[PDB]
Amino acid sequence: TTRVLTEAAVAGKRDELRGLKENVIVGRLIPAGTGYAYHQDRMRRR
Amino acid sequence: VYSYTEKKRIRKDFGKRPQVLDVPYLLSIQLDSFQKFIEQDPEGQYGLEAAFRSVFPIQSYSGNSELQYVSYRLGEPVFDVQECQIRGVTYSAPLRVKLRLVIYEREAPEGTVKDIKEQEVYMGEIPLMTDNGTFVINGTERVIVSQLHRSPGVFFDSDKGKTHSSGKVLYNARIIPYRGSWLDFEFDPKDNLFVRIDRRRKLPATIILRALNYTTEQILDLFFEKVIFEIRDNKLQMELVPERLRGETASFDIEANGKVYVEKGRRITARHIRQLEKDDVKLIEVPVEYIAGKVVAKDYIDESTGELICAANMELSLDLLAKLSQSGHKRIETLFTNDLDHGPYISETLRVDPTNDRLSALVEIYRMMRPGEPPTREAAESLFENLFFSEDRYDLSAVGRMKFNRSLLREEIEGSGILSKDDIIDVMKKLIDIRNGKGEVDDIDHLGNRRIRSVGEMAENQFRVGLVRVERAVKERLSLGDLDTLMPQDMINAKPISAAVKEFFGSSQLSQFMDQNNPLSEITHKRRISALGPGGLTRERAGFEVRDVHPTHYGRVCPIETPEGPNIGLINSLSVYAQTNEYGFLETPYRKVTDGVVTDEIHYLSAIEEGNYVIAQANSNLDEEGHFVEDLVTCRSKGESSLFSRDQVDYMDVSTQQVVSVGASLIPFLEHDDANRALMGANMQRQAVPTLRADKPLVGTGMERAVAVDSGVTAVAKRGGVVQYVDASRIVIKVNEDEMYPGEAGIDIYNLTKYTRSNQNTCINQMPCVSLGEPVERGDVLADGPSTDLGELALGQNMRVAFMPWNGYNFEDSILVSERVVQEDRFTTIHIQELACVSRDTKLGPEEITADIPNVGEAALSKLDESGIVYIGAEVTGGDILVGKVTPKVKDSSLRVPNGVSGTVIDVQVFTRDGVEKDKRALEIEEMQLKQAKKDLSEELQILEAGLFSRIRAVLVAGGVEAEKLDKLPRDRWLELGLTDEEKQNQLEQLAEQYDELKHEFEKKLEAKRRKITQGDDLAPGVLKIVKVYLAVKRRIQPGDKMAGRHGNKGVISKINPIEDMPYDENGTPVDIVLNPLGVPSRMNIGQILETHLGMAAKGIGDKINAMLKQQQEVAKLREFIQRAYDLGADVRQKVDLSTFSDEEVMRLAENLRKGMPIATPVFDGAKEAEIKELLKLGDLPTSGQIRLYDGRTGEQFERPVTVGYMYMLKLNHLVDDKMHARSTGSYSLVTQQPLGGKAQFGGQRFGEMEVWALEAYGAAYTLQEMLTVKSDDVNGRTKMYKNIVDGNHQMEPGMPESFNVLLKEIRSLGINIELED
Amino acid sequence: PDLRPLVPLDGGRFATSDLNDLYRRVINRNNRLKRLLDLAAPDIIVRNEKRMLQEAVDALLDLADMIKGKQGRFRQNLLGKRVDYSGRSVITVGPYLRLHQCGLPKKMALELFKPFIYGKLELRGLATTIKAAKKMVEREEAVVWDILDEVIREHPVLLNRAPTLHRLGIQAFEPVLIEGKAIQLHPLVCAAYNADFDGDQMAVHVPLTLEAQLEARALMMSTNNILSPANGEPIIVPSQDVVLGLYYMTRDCVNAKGEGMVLTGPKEAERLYRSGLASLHARVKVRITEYEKDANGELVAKTSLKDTTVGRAILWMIVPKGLPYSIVNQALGKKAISKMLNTCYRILGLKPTVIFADQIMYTGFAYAARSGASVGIDDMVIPEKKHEIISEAEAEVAEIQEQFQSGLVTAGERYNKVIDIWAAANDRVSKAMMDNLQTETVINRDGQEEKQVSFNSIYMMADSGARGSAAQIRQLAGMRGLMAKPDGSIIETPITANFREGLNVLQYFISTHGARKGLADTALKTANSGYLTRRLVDVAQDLVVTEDDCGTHEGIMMTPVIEGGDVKEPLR
Amino acid sequence: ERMGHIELASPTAHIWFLKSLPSRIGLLLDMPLRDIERVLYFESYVVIE
DNA sequence: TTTTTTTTTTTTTTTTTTTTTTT
DNA sequence: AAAAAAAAAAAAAAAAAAAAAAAAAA
Ligand SMILES: [Mg+2]
């Protein structure tokens, strides 16, 4: 936690939320299985 | 001849090896240790007096006031063990120390003190050891596990392997005190020796050596020998001794007397050394160049300059040789350097040394100890000196000194606790010696390097800590010392000693909470050796060398009982005969052997003494004299085994069992099954559960007697006698007059313990096992504790088992059980749960215990008395009320039964804070206990008076016998009858005085008991009264409970079928339990099959006995049959006839054997294949042990006959209803809104990280989102999903995880700014 | 404050986290610093105050543990989250189940679907207030059970074990309400879970939403997972009892009842065996019809006289149409059945394979029961040459020992020679024991005499591959070989004894040396493998298949692997 | 949901950036971490302008 | 005599819960 | 009597990485 949070804070790195672990943290559909199709819809919006 | 109590059911045995040492009191360890912990022994010698003499006397510096010791006493406890168990107080005793204080005058130290005082100061209390060998701490029963800690002294280690990945083996030495800062030395790839204290920053070693006021010249001379170059007009001729020439290549010609002895370039062979020796050639010539590579040892100065010609420890050369030559010093000293014999280690460290003087060395050590401060001369001096040379912060006990001297090849074993310069010097010498090849590193796993701390030593340590704390406080207050205005009750504070000892006994990684669901669980939980705990290692820091059994574990530690998994081998259990040495080492028995005779004496040997001797293995054939019948016998000498000659072995193993422990010696036919499943079974057997009827396991190992009698569960008799009055409650024994003391005659009474909670909630109880009016032998079982019968350890039950895969219900290891098993009430266990309701006082009023409760169905109040408490015997079901507690406002907060549990209240205790009103049912229980105590004391006095007056009658048989006048008047006056001038009248007067004293004692003891009961049992501060209800639930066996044999053949009980469809033999008997054959080969335990065969044979003989007894076959037939059964073939130790057995005894034996014949089998000296077939042959059952079986459903034969016998199977404490736990929606956690875990809280399972990976491994996405957002976290989401579900909709509303926002807030609490975007 | 609650313990006391203590310390120190600065204290005292305040802020901040550690928010509360609608129990076997369903205790069923039963009762109209349904379920009204059968009708649930290693660690199953308190499990699927029935506890979860229900049935249903993700080998390979039953069903003996006749079809073969008039195995000609789709997906029937075995013909009724006949003309060991299921899956798709696996389990357990394949102590014969081989080995080692005594060889040479000859003698005993066992049967053929593959119980259970193997049987009858002293330094006095005979004390000590290291290995090896898997999944989380084809030509060369001998793994 | 705050009379140096190894403030000012720690712990002085 | 490279050494991570000391 | 850290057991084994010291120049 220490190193990662320090680097994120100093860099001010916005999070893209593309993989599978981060999305689980956020609590939204994983872009891995069925949710992929849903993501294929949402990315189509933008 | 055997004890008639054993004649009740004499166990058949097959052990051929004649025993020589009976199994000792299995609990010798704890009992002996705590006996050592408390007794009046002078001169210390490992006792409390040792601690007192260590810390007393106490005097302030020049205070003219010393505080000396006299003696100590431990008065009676305040209660007795059972009373402490029921109430909760610690079964403790006081410490009355006769303390003597005297003060001097000014300038009269040797002069007599002007004042003296002595008083029996009181200093807290300490727990004592119950008879069984336990401790009662807060009402529970706790036992302290002996620790196997690394022994003090000096120990050398290699540290090979991945050290630098260079292959250069390092070396290091450690001096470990029994109490104090460690000391460590190690080498390095640069071969520079180093030191370090308490694993702090590394330092060179010479610096510490120099810190002992050693000059560098002194150090070099001490460490290295001298080589003397003499200037004889040129060339610096050498005094050469041959001894220092081995393995050397001479680059210059070596000659003397004008004759060449070693030509240039020729290496010194042994023959050259012989030449220089025989020729006695010592003085030789050397060239200047040869001295260039050498190193000066000391320092020289010139006559005029007086300056440093050359520093010590520096290489020479021609210019330096001239520089020292002008001074004209004839003696040129060097230290012998040879990379193969003596390397430049200390010299290199001297080169690395930072400074020279002692002050700078002390400064360096002071900075290292407490870095970041100014070093000081005096402070550093004191720090270094008392860090190792003061009892304040250092001490090596006797065993520490023993190891230290035995590892430096010293002679004396007794020395000072502190070290000395010579000691560290010899440690250096040994370390360098081993570096040079001579001497070997000490394998730590060797037991002699490890030692067993028992309860006595740990309690001594903590008592010492408390004593030193109170002593420091005493000195602080004596600094204010005043003129005798006080007695010595204010120097001594009770809080430190009691605090330390109680903290140890209550909270201690070793003082584990006792395991009590067996006899054997105790007997093998107090004989447990835990490598963990303070002073030992921890699970993390344990490689696979400590765990592994060392080949010296033989005879001292069991290799086949250790907990499996996270700690294998860290909790090795003690052996059977293994005991502790005086110094703490593990001694084991052996049989002394002369030239060729195995002397029947016994000789105990330690872990190191064994290696020196060569020891013969247990099962070596001897014939009537001990002379081995084979010249070459298998024997072990030094960590290894091989064949050795007959006239070479001076020691023999005592009994073939001394390799194993009580926790595994009971596994019958152990020698046939693999070590793996043997270990698993041995662990399992400790997890049995006391069933409803102990059933004398058919296949035993003859150790059942010792475990049952010594475990303490069985109320073993104390003085032989006749069982006058028997009952489930008490047993009364009339001791024989010869066995009873003349005065204080009386009789004996045992109050059998009834159904009470065991520490794992299983039922512990006793039942009488002696008929009314029968003789009893001293030290014999009278009541059979749980899982026992007739004084034999019966954990599970013998059952008819058959090995065949029956319709797939025995797939992996599952066990199929006929309904007949549960019908007969065989495995039905009794569990007892304790539930507590506390009545405190808080703001807005106290918590009453009334019955009146708002908004409760009257049926709830029906089961309570008027007070609001349940009766003894009202079957309670989940949800109802036990005790009515109300919080003033007023709101109902009454105690309720935990959800999902049946029960039938068996007892309700009610303790009340001293000086508080007793409520209706509390008064009722008070009256109950009062009446019970009154009845006990009254019947005691009445029967005692009856015995005394019967003695008076016997006395009056002569000396004025008056039959008419004896019954004319009642027992009020029996001393007024006429007698002559005889001592009988005096004895009658003595008996009348005894009667009056008995009346007075009964009255006053009854008063004391009434006071004990009347004073409400005090409670913790803040609470008014506590009520504990015991619910006594009964659990049968259902499809999912666990049961297993003794060889580790686990299995969860599957579908229990109706009796009809089980396989049935030709005779029709069903087979109760149908295991899986396929578990035999892979899990290599063929023991269970032989056990099953022997079980079938045992029940064959049992069936024959039962048949010949059902028919009237008086004595003769059964007598001869039993006698035939008991001899049965080869040599056996039993050799039991039956003429001594009177017909009554014979028929009692037959009755107790009708259910089967208990067969014994010592572990490795057990029954072979030949004898089992012989026993079967005595029966009417097939020799092979296989009988055809008919399928229950189809009703036709099974081809390929199957194996059926009687195997002893346990029930393990994993009941399905204890595990089966579910939830739909209940309370969530507060800090995070997540479902609770565990079982005590009504929780839900854990969807762990691994489960999440497995889910996303599929394409399953929505399910994971539901799992970790809507079903676990989203506070609003789950409510909405519930509402939708009740409305028939399966719609999901995402929302957001609550704990996610919690994390966001928390990290925003730090100096982090995190937010959400579009 | 809510995230730092002041929880009072069971009585008149407060025991909350250190956060409140740290905050109290920080605020107290800050107030004291403000007060001292108001008092204008000397720079030394205020310096101490500022340093103390800095320390207090350090202690309050390093929250870290809440975010750090195995018990941190990310790992204990975000990733691995306890969940409602869950339960657990000890597992137990049941044959009567089909692969697409698993049993469930009634109590857990009524407890898990309680929201579902309340909703179903409300919709059904049998009650209006949900409390009425609550009192109904508490009363265990018989109506509730019918509602339970309605909800459970087809509503998969997830059955997960404790160490979830591979994706098969969680499988869906159709519940089948059953009395008791044990989670009944399909036997075959057990092999996937690495779940043995020695008391292992499995958890049950319930999908809630229609998305999740379809998700569980379409992916996590046990039918959809009969081929493992690690490799193409089937994962539903029948394990130990089914295999023994099948193998005993198809194994030729020289002669038995019904030997030497002609049967018109499998049906009368079953009729003959079950009636007891014909032995379960006897080489016999019969008529079998096999269906082959060699054409363009069209079944062609072929029939003729086949030499087979009665039990084999009976088994043939369970194979579907497509498969050939020679597949069941062998002994049907474990590997044979595995590749037979693989052929079924490859040639007939999926549903036939699921039906076939259920049927093969049924027909394996049944005939294993009919076999009565027990194990008595006389099922493992000690070859007579064991004593003679051992005595010759003793003579040889003594001769080499005295040769070393004379100084002809070194200690190392003597040690190596002794170990080598002990190994050779061990191999000799092994061969003697295998020759004794495998062809033990010496029986009449209706003529004088004949040998055949042995029917000795242990040999049957070892040859079929049910449990154990040549290595495991070897130490049940012949010598255990030579076990290792603590460091692998194999002792020059091997275990001359075997489990059937007795083991002396020292040989058992040596066996303990051998086995304790294995147990400790298992423990710490599992500990380390958990962390290896942890890193492996962590470093490959992002990769999710996203494109059909990159249109790239580059690649890697693929060739068979040879290290310096025969091919270890072929190109295929 | 609602948070709080404490107005500190003396500024406080956040600690995560102090011992991150490499410290953020450490190489941001291009000075060794030991000197920074000593200065912050009121046992030394630093030059400003 | 200063400066770059490499080596060595020190420190910080990697799978059950707080009294004593000073002002 | 009130406020505050962990100096007050502990070390194993291994690895990553930072800081200091020692070659080896030109
Ligand atoms: Mg298991």
Walk me through the structure.
The structure is cut from a larger assembly and holds 3 copies of chain A and 1 copy of chain B (1318 residues). With 46 residues, chain A is mainly alpha-helical. Chain A contains 3 helices and no strands. Chain A has helices at 2-11, 21-26, 34-45. With 1318 residues, chain B is of the alpha+beta class. Chain B folds into 9 domains: 25-151 and 444-574, no CATH class; 152-224 and 343-443, RNA polymerase Rpb2, domain 2 (Dna-directed Rna Polymerase Ii 140kd Polypeptide, Chain: B, domain 3, Alpha-Beta Complex), CATH 3.90.1110; 225-342, no CATH class; 575-655, Rna Polymerase Beta Subunit, Chain: C, domain 4, CATH 2.30.150.10; 656-712 and 788-827 and 1036-1219, Dna-directed Rna Polymerase Ii 140kd Polypeptide, Chain: B, Domain 6 (Beta Barrel); 713-787, Beta Barrel (OB fold (Dihydrolipoamide Acetyltransferase, E2P)), CATH 2.40.50; 828-916 and 1017-1035, RNA polymerase II, Rpb2 subunit, wall domain (OB fold (Dihydrolipoamide Acetyltransferase, E2P), Beta Barrel), CATH 2.40.50.150; 917-1016, Helix Hairpins (Helix non-globular), CATH 6.10.140; and more. Helices cover 29% and strands 17% of the residues of chain B. Chain B has 36 helices and 55 strands. In chain B, strands 25, 26, 27, 28, 29, 30 and 31 form a 7-stranded mixed sheet that branches. In chain B, strands 40, 41, 50, 51, 52 and 53 form a 6-stranded mixed sheet that branches. In chain B, helix 15 packs antiparallel against helix 16. Chain B is globular. Chain B starts with a helix and ends in a 9-residue tail after the last helix. At the B-C interface, helix 20, strand 42, helix 27, helix 28 and helix 32 of B face helix 4, strand 1, strand 2, helix 5 and helix 6 of C. The site of magnesium ion has 3 residues of chain C, from loops. The structure holds a DNA duplex (23 and 26 nucleotides). Chain C: It comes from Escherichia coli O139:H28 (strain E24377A / ETEC). Chain C: Mg(2+) binds at residues 196, 198, 200. Chain C: Zn(2+) 2 binds at residue 550.
